[PDB]
Design a protein around this ligand. Sequence first.
Ligand SMILES: N#CC[C@@H](N)c1ccccc1
Lengths: 300, 237
Amino acid sequence: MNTVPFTSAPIEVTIGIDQYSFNVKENQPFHGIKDIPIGHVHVIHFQHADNSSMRYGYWFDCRMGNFYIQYDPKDGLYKMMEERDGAKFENIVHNFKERQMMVSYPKIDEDDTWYNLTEFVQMDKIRKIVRKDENQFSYVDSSMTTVQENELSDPAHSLNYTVINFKSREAIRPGHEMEDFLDKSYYLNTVMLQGIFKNSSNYFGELQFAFLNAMFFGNYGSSLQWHAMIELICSSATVPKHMLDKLDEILYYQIKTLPEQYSDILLNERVWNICLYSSFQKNSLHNTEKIMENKYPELL
Amino acid sequence: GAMNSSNYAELFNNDIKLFVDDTNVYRVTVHKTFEGNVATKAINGCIFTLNPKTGHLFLKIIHTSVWAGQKRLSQLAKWKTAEEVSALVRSLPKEEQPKQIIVTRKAMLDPLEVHMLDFPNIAIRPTELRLPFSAAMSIDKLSDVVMKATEPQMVLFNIYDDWLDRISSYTAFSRLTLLLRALKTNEESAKMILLSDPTITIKSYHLWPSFTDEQWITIESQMRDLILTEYGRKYNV
Ligand SMILES: N#CC[C@@H](N)c1ccccc1
């Protein structure tokens, strides 16, 4: 089990760790988060009590380094940083464990939620979407735009998601215009899966990462990417049977986890109704359709 | 974006543009089968592609063979239209290609956008105008060439005849849309008005009769009377 220690908590802040969250008061004696499961990526995120504007946070994998949080009073945010001195970090983390000034990652034993939301997410792919090569962890916030959003502004602070555009020459073979627009299988299977992502695991990883940035940061371009990647599968008549089964599981746990009160802004009525009721795959997402109908029957 | 009454003079500026109407592409007669079921029989159709400034009409005749063995023909018809319009644009020299294409029905937007991906600078627009171009097949010489076709064929017409020698494009378009609106609302009466006087003929190389300016004013008034009359017969007013 790994640990993310904090220098201090000088400003009152709501701290998220994966799907959990807790409040810390101004100058409360808080030194961090312990018992973080090894084997998964994680995200530690922040919303300041005094300016709910800008949720921000850090994707990280504890197997890649020892990471700590230090408040920067100049830039005004909790920053993640790496400590290279292993001896000292373990000593610092041991002292705080002894003085019980850390919250425990509160994983219920029966609970596979986080695994099910991050099954295909890999820190190496995150770092290609979020380009900042000097750090092993990745910063995301509410306001960051995507490469596709910029095409339609600072490129160093963008989310480099894979561009999906259904009315593009990449998506449409010359002389297959109707065929390829109405059945997107060539774009899904040849262009994106064989061509760009190489396999469905990388595709699902980006899909899952886009959803999580949408949910945890209210990042609008991430929400766009998540829906686009769902729509491309739902709108393909020919999808490997194992991808459809896995997609149904992925979406089920995403819909299960979404706050009930954020559905209005994180769920696109058109995509979901198309995917569940009109599309080629309308009969292939049984788990997802059941949870959507029972939890968000208004959207549909 | 969309084309309406606030930007109507745009149609007659010097940016090349075409209206595309797909109403008459897929045409059928519905009939009873021997078993008493219902079946359709396709008949020849046409794409109506019109330059509103010049009157140049590119009439692509859609022969019934194009539907053979195909499914979902009303959806295919939109994509076949888009394919044929795209092929027309590619066939034109660069300086004759449109800068905008206005579709009369919003369902043509995506088919045409997809077929025109190679032309990102050509704007594809809908319109809020309810234009009467479906009545093109009430012009006898256009109906004749469509019904006689035994194969796909493109035929070029000027739908304004020689009117632009005497009137502006704006007025010529207004006359055309009045004539077509009348033919759409009551075809028999409209054609009666157009041909009642045998001394006024249709030149071999024209679509409409050779009316003088005075006679066109009278014709135009009769067509508005007809349209108002039908509106009254329809709504009892
Ligand atoms: N390790 C380490 C680095 C040091 N800056 C520090 C001090 C207290 C709490 C967390 C980190």
